[PDB]
Design a binder for this molecule. Structure first.
Ligand SMILES: CCCCCCCCCCCCCCCCCC(=O)OC[C@H](COP(=O)([O-])OC[C@H](O)COP(=O)([O-])OC[C@H](COC(=O)CCCCCCCCCCCCCCCCC)OC(=O)CCCCCCCCCCCCCCCCC)OC(=O)CCCCCCCCCCCCCCCCC
Lengths: 63, 57
């Protein structure tokens, strides 16, 4: 290989691997924040569906 | 002059004209929590793949 080719190929490798490393660090920080706060699309543990509630008039009024 | 109701009449659901207002919050409920943001946007591929340690795809 030419030194130019190896040099610029090394630069492409370094850019790809540095971008992957920054995305892994951001992924760790995102997972930490979403587990702590629960406001993201991850760590959404189920609650009861409110569509199961009967909203009809019952046999007694006070409900 | 009173007529006794037939079989089935006293079990009817009738309509009532009232002057009192409809209760806007009869359960005395407070404000519901704001929902989480939904997903939106076009789904692009993962940047440089899985990024699992050395896999490039
Ligand atoms: C226009 C339409 C048509 C277009 C057609 C174009 C194609 C034309 C040619 C057709 C053939 C194409 C073949 C696929 C492309 C080349 C893939 C490749 O070599 O990846 C390099 C891959 C990464 O190298 P690279 O330089 O970064 O990328 C070059 C390319 O860009 C690689 O491209 P990439 O970056 O996209 O690669 C993606 C990713 C790149 O890889 C990664 O991201 C890294 C992780 C790789 C896995 C590491 C696993 C480590 C632990 C297990 C070790 C296994 C034990 C060793 C084997 C024991 C003996 C069987 O690969 C994977 O994730 C796949 C996993 C590895 C399988 C590779 C394909 C094998 C197909 C044939 C299998 C035959 C048996 C092979 C041996 C079994 C083990 C593989 O090399 C290695 O990891 C080293 C191992 C070599 C892989 C096998 C070589 C394939 C050809 C073997 C033929 C001879 C077989 C002899 C008989 C059977 C064995 C006894």
């Amino acid at each position: 290989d030419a030194p130019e080719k190896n040099y610029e190929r090394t630069m492409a490798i370094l850019q790809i691997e540095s971008e992957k490393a920054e995305l892994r660090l951001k992924e760790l920080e995102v997972r930490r924040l979403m587990r702590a706060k629960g406001d993201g699309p991850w760590f959404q543990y189920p609650t009861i569906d409110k569509a199961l509630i009967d909203h009809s008039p019952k046999a007694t009024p006070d409900n | 002059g009173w007529v006794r109701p037939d079989l089935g009449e006293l079990s009817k659901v009738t309509k009532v004209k009232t002057d009192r207002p409809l209760p806007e919050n009869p359960y005395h409920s407070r404000a519901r929590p704001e929902p989480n943001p939904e997903v939106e946007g076009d789904l692009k591929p993962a940047r440089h793949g899985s990024r699992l340690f050395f896999w490039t795809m």
